[PDB]
C-alpha cells in the first residue's frame, strides 16, 4: 500500500497535510506515504520518517492557473508529479486538498478514466440527521457542469458499488434527484434506472429531504449536484452564525447546540470527495482541511484500496 | 382594485384564507375580494360581509393541465377565469403549485414576447429583515434557454427596482464558480447574453454557499436548478431548527430564543407569495401550510404590484 500526497494543496497545507499523515501513521503502521512539495517546508512537520518519502518540487498549482493547461504545462507542481506517480504505478492512489478543477484534470489527463466510463462523478458520503455512522453518497456533486442520461444512469452503478463494497450498505436504494415525486434529462434518466433490474432503483428523491435518509445513493447531474451541495453547506454555516452570534453576546446549551449542528453537518469524517470513475483512487480533502480531514481521506483511501473496489470497477467495465 | 381568491386551496383552507381576507380588509378597506369555493364553508369565517362577494363551487383541484382545461367549475379555475375575463385584476391561491402554473400560463396568458413564466420570490438576507432578493425561476420550468435568463433577469429587475423599491438592483447569475467561462451550456451563454443587456445592472456570477447573504438583488437561475436550491435551503433550515426543538423539549430559554430568530430569519412569505412573473396580471401562489398572516402578506404584495403598475411596464417593455 502506498499512497501520493499533494502536500502543497490546502489553505493549511503543508502544515495540515503532513499533521495528518503524522496520524494515519499510527492508524496503518505499514502504509508508505510520498509527500510531493518543497522538502524545507515539508519537513518542518515531520515527526516521524518511517514509511515517509520526500518528492521536493518547488512548483505548485497556482491560485489560480486555468486547470487543464496547467495539469499539461507545469508538470512539476506537487499535484501533478503525484498523479504521474499513480498512472506510473509508484502510488496506489493520490488525495490533494488543493483546487478541485486542476485535480479533476489530472484524473482525467493522466490518472485515467476506465474505459466505459465517458463521465467520472465527484461523490460524497453525506450527513443522513441522527445517525452519525450513516450517510449517502450523491454525485456527480461538480466534476462536470452537463450531463446526460446515460451518465446518470452509470453515477447509480458507481455509486451503489462505492456504498455496498466501500460502506458496507447492502443492496443500496438508488434514487434520482428531481423537482417533485422533471427535466428532459431526468426524465430520460428516470425511464433507463427503472427499467435495470441491477439497480435497486428507488424513484425520485426530493431536496427537502436529503438529509433525512431518503436513499444510500442520489443521483444528479454536476451542476445541480454542486447547486446542492452548496446550498446545503450555505444554510447550514449561516444557520450556525446565527448561533455564534447569540454565543457571543444558560449560554452552555447554546454552546452544546452549536457543537451538536457542527457534528451532524461534519461529512468529511467519512472521507473526501471521491473522483469516481478513474482507474485508481482519487481524493479530494476540503481545502480548509486541518489534520483530521487528512486522516479520515486516508481512512477512506485504505478501505478502496483494501476492498479493491476500483480494480472490481475496472473488471465490470473494461 | 378587485382580487379573485381561491379559497379552496392549502392546508389550512378555508379558515385560513378568509381570515387572511378579513385583516386584509383593514389594511385595504376598498379592495373588493372575490371568494371562490362552497359558501357554507366560506360563511363561517366571515367576520365582516363589506365587500367579500361569494362564487359558490362544491369542485376543488385534488394532472395540472388536463384538470384545468377540464374541471371549469373549480375554485381556483374560476378565479383564474375571472382575470382573464376582465372581471378581476389579480388573483391569489395556496392550492396546488403544477394547477396553478397551468391555471396561469393557459387561461390569464403571459404577457406578449417572454417566452416563460418564472416562479419567483423574495428570499431572505441574514440580519436585515427589510432586505430580500428575488430569485427566478424557481420551478415554473425544468427546462430553460440561455435568452428565458435574460428575461428573468428583466422580470426580476422590474419587480426589485418597482414593487420593492431596490434601486438599479443587482442581477447575479447562479453558477458553478466566479470565472466567466465557468458554466453548463446554459450558463455559458446565459452570462454572455446578460454582459451584453444594457437594460440590467449584471453583477456577474453568484454561488449558491452565500444566496442568504445579500450578493444580489435578482438572482437568476433555470426552474429545474431553482427548484433545487430553493428546497434545499428549505430542507436544510428545517433540519437546523429539528436540531434545536429537540434539545427544547429535553438556560432552556436561551435555545428556544434562537429557534424562534431562525424561524425568524426564515420566515419569507412576510413578504408575499411567490409569483407566476411575466402573466398578463398578478398571480401570487401562497403556501400550502399558511395562515391567515401569509395570506395577509400575499393581499399586500398584489396592492403594491397593483398599485406600482408593474405587470403595465412589463408590457410596455416588452
Known amino acids: 500500500m502506498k499512497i501520493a500526497v499533494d502536500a502543497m494543496g490546502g489553505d493549511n497545507a503543508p502544515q495540515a497535510i503532513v ?34 518519502t520526500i518528492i521536493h518540487t518547488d512548483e505548485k498549482i497556482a491560485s489560480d492557473d486555468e486547470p487543464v493547461k496547467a495539469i499539461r504545462r507545469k508538470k512539476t507542481a506537487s499535484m501533478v508529479l503525484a498523479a504521474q506517480a499513480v498512472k506510473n504505478g509508484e502510488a ?18 493522466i490518472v485515467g478514466r476506465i474505459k466505459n466510463v465517458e463521465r467520472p462523478g465527484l461523490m460524497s458520503t453525506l450527513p443522513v440527521m441522527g445517525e452519525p455512522d450513516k450517510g449517502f453518497d450523491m454525485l456527480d456533486l461538480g466534476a462536470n457542469a452537463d450531463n446526460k442520461p446515460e451518465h446518470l444512469v452509470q453515477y447509480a452503478v458507481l455509486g451503489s ?35 435495470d433490474e ?45 448561533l455564534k452570534t447569540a454565543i457571543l453576546s ?22 473526501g470527495a471521491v473522483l469516481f470513475g478513474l482507474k485508481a483512487p482519487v481524493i479530494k480533502t476540503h481545502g480548509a482541511t486541518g ?4 486522516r479520515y481521506t486516508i481512512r477512506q483511501i485504505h478501505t478502496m484500496l483494501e476492498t479493491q473496489v476500483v480494480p472490481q470497477l475496472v473488471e465490470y467495465y473494461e
Open 92 to 109: 496506489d492512489a493520490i488525495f490533494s486538498a488543493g483546487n478541485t478543477g486542476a485535480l479533476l484534470a489530472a484524473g482525467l489527463f
Open 291 to 294: 489534520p483530521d480531514a487528512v
Open 198 to 242: 441491477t439497480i435497486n432503483f428507488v424513484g425520485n428523491v426530493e431536496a427537502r429531504e436529503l438529509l433525512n435518509g431518503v436513499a444510500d445513493v442520489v443521483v444528479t447531474d454536476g451542476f445541480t449536484g454542486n447547486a446542492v451541495l452548496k446550498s446545503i453547506e450555505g444554510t447550514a454555516m449561516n444557520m450556525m452564525s446565527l
Open 250 to 271: 444558560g449560554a452552555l446549551l447554546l454552546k452544546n447546540a452549536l457543537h451538536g449542528m457542527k457534528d451532524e453537518m461534519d461529512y468529511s469524517k467519512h472521507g
Open 161 to 195: 458499488f462505492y456504498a455496498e463494497k466501500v460502506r458496507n450498505v447492502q443492496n443500496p436504494r438508488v434514487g434520482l434527484l428531481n423537482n417533485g415525486t422533471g427535466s428532459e434529462l431526468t426524465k430520460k434518466a428516470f425511464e433507463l434506472l427503472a427499467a
Open 19 to 52: 499533521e495528518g499523515v503524522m496520524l494515519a501513521k499510527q492508524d496503518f503502521p505499514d502504509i508508505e506515504f510520498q509527500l510531493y512539495g518543497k522538502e524545507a517546508e515539508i519537513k518542518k512537520y515531520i515527526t516521524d520518517e518511517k514509511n515517509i
